[PDB]
Amino acid sequence: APAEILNGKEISAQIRARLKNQVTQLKEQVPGFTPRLAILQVGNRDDSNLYINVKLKAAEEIGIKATHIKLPRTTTESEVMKYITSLNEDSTVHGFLVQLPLDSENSINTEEVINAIAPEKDVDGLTSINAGRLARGDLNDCFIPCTPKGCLELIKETGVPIAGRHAVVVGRSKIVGAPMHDLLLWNNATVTTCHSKTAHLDEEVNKGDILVVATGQPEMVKGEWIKPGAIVIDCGINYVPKVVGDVAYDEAKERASFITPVPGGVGPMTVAMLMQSTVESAKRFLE
Amino acid sequence: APAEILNGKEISAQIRARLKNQVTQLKEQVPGFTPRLAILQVGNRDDSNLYINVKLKAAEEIGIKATHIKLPRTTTESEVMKYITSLNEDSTVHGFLVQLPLDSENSINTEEVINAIAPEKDVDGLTSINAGRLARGDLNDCFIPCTPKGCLELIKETGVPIAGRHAVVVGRSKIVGAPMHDLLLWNNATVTTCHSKTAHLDEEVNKGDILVVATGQPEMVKGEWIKPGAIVIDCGINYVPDDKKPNGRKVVGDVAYDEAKERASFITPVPGGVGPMTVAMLMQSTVESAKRFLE
Numbered sequence: 120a121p122a123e124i125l126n127g128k129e130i131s132a133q134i135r136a137r138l139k140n141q142v143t144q145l146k147e148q149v150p151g152f153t154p155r156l157a158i159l160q161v162g163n164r165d166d167s168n169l170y171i172n173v174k175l176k177a178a179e180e181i182g183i184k185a186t187h188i189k190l191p192r193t194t195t196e197s198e199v200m201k202y203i204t205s206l207n208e209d210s211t212v213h214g215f216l217v218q219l220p221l222d223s224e225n226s227i228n229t230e231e232v233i234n235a236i237a238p239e240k241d242v243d244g245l246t247s248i249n250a251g252r253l254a255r256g257d258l259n260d261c262f263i264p265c266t267p268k269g270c271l272e273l274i275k276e277t278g279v280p281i282a283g284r285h286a287v288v289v290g291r292s293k294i295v296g297a298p299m300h301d302l303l304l305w306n307n308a309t310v311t312t313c314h315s316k317t318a319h320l321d322e323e324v325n326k327g328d329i330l331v332v333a334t335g336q337p338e339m340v341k342g343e344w345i346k347p348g349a350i351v352i353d354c355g356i357n358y359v360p361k362v363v364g365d366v367a368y369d370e371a372k373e374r375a376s377f378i379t380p381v382p383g384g385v386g387p388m389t390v391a392m393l394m395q396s397t398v399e400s401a402k403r404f405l406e
Numbered sequence: 407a408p409a410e411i412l413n414g415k416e417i418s419a420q421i422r423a424r425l426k427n428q429v430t431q432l433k434e435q436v437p438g439f440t441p442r443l444a445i446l447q448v449g450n451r452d453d454s455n456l457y458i459n460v461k462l463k464a465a466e467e468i469g470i471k472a473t474h475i476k477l478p479r480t481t482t483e484s485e486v487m488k489y490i491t492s493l494n495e496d497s498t499v500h501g502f503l504v505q506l507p508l509d510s511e512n513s514i515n516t517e518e519v520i521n522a523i524a525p526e527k528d529v530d531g532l533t534s535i536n537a538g539r540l541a542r543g544d545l546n547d548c549f550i551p552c553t554p555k556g557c558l559e560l561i562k563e564t565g566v567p568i569a570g571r572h573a574v575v576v577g578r579s580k581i582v583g584a585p586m587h588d589l590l591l592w593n594n595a596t597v598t599t600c601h602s603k604t605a606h607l608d609e610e611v612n613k614g615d616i617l618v619v620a621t622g623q624p625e626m627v628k629g630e631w632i633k634p635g636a637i638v639i640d641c642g643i644n645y646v647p648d649d650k651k652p653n654g655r656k657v658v659g660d661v662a663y664d665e666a667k668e669r670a671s672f673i674t675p676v677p678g679g680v681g682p683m684t685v686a687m688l689m690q691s692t693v694e695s696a697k698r699f700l701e
């Protein structure tokens with residue numbers, strides 16, 4: 120009766136080992152060349168501090184040079200833009216991202232900041248240029264946001280093809296839900312996107328051969344709602360009376376065929392995909 | 407109940423009259439100000455010439471200043487790009503579009519040309535930057551491609567709110583299907599997108615309280631498939647020969663209209679439905695661009 124456990128910790132480790140071998144070979148082929156990632160943080164949130172360290176540690180194990188720039192809570196939009204512009208022009212820097220959410224005492228427009236990022240270095244894939252390419256089916260030449268990229272990879276580890284399947288995405292955020300739809304749609308699923316104004320959410324979820332939940336409501340998607348045999352991808356990271364997903368795992372694992380645990384599921388794959396995007400940016404720059 | 411007929415010909419006429427009144431008032435409020443559209447053509451295709459005249463005539467009736475720049479077939483990519491760049495920088499020009507397809511004797515990359523358009527003037531809404539803004543929820547100020555804009559307007563003329571309805575889009579094209587999803591999603595429908603690899607397309611369509619079909623397969627979506635009470639938006643323009651018609655051809659939609667009209671509550675006929683909304687929507691987008699510039 121248990122669903123097969125998609126082990127994001129093992130799978131991300133396989134990916135990071137592969138990338139390390141890729142990165143080793145670029146240094147042997149072009150000695151002294153170093154792929155380089157930069158992460159720009161605003162404020163000092165404890166969760167952002169933790170997530171940034173995980174990105175930095177994965178990078179340094181692969182042989183990527185990872186720079187961390189922490190700006191204080193007093194920072195303004197103009198200052199943030201000056202750094203974006205400097206990283207744009209610093210040719211030693213192949214990929215960079217702005218960690219979200221921004222922790223400033225001033226108003227800052229997240230979209231204007233992200234959209235100043237040079238699209239060739241937009242490893243998080245959150246620029247409108249990259250979003251627009253993904254949303255319209257032009258996957259040849261954009262970055263894809265790291266969380267949905269990781270989710271797509273996890274779905275593929277099942278061996279079950281996506282084409283013609285009815286997939287359901289619960290959530291439509293810029294970072295996960297909306298690009299998750301687009302990735303599923305352009306891999307030929309029939310995709311239903313749900314959100315907070317969706318009526319009869321249970322009956323929608325029950326149609327999902329593929330289910331990707333990204334809502335930030337702890338365990339809200341019950342196991343009864345899960346289609347028997349579904350692939351369940353749980354993007355949730357919620358702290359409770361302990362970390363739980365957006366899916367009620369214990370009840371969902373009896374119904375699903377493949378499921379992502381929390382932690383050890385989507386989380387470590389998000390970082391592996393960031394590193395993959397960083398190495399692609401470094402490879403394209405060598406031309 | 408036979409379905410209420412959404413008359414695109416009347417509704418587009420109401421919109422064009424209203425925009426004219428809007429445009430008159432902006433000139434009286436801010437004297438000297440002239441909303442301005444530019445259309446850039448390459449070559450001399452007969453269909454493009456016809457479509458451009460219709461756009462220009464609608465614009466001049468509204469009081470929009472409409473510039474037509476027709477470049478010869480000998481034109482190169484570099485020349486086309488130089489014009490795009492000049493219209494980008496010409497501050498008197500609020501909206502512009504490149505009419506497609508381009509008719510040149512030289513190779514020209516249509517995607518690179520379109521994507522050089524400044525996103526703030528992209529009234530046809532096809533740039534990647536504008537598509538991305540629409541796709542991720544920035545409907546306050548992005549441009550919307552004219553066909554799905556027209557579809558959204560027609561849905562609203564019913565008075566039936568969109569929020570929490572299950573909507574179905576059959577088709578995912580850059581021109582119609584994909585931007586149609588985004589409009590529906592950001593008006594709080596739960597949206598299911600279908601395409602050529604969708605299995606059991608009939609049973610998907612049957613879940614649609616709102617249905618927007620844009621496939622180019624004549625009458626493929628049968629009336630049986632339609633959910634009782636649905637709003638049916640038919641984007642199809644498919645020609646079938648017919649000697650009983652003045653010009654020897656009939657137009658049918660992507661929906662089997664006669665069988666679908668018994669099941670739906672509101673439906674768009676073909677012709678006279680989505681089609682005549684097209685140009686009015688370009689003009690509406692042009693005035694939005696002019697209004698934002700006035701600030």
Ligand SMILES: NC(=O)c1ccc[n+]([C@@H]2O[C@H](COP(=O)([O-])OP(=O)(O)OC[C@H]3O[C@@H](n4cnc5c(N)ncnc54)[C@H](OP(=O)(O)O)[C@@H]3O)[C@@H](O)[C@H]2O)c1
Nearest residue numbers: 266290291292295314315333334335354355356385386389
């Ligand atoms: N593992 C990773 O790498 C990773 C990355 C990013 C985020 N996350 C985690 O994933 C979760 C969500 O992330 P996010 O960035 O996508 O969040 P977000 O921006 O807060 O958006 C959450 C989405 O869930 C929808 N939602 C909320 N309540 C709902 C309900 N009752 N029924 C249906 N849908 C509902 C919202 O709809 P509306 O748009 O209508 O508000 C929204 O689209 C959080 O736990 C977050 O920590 C994980």
Ligand SMILES: NC(=O)c1ccc[n+]([C@@H]2O[C@H](COP(=O)([O-])OP(=O)(O)OC[C@H]3O[C@@H](n4cnc5c(N)ncnc54)[C@H](OP(=O)(O)O)[C@@H]3O)[C@@H](O)[C@H]2O)c1
Nearest residue numbers: 553577578579581582601602620621622641642643681684
């Ligand atoms: N009145 C106007 O001004 C106006 C403007 C633009 C378009 N239109 C009309 O709208 C229609 C569609 O145009 P378009 O530009 O979207 O066409 P398109 O670019 O050819 O795309 C057609 C879409 O329909 C899908 N499709 C095709 N056969 C299907 C099937 N058997 N089952 C399900 N989906 C199927 C295709 O699937 P795949 O994604 O799998 O290829 C694709 O997504 C045409 O009749 C066109 O003339 C009207």
Ligand SMILES: Nc1nc2c(c(=O)[nH]1)N1C(=O)N(c3ccc(C(=O)N[C@@H](CCC(=O)O)C(=O)O)cc3)C[C@H]1CN2
Nearest residue numbers: 128170173217218219220243265356382383384386387
């Ligand atoms: N622009 C931007 N902002 C952002 C992200 C982003 O991509 N781009 N995000 C991440 O990196 N996040 C994340 C989440 C989890 C982890 C992570 O490694 N835990 C694992 C631990 C895995 C294990 O080793 O067992 C987990 O949740 O299970 C590592 C980064 C969250 C989100 C927050 N904000």
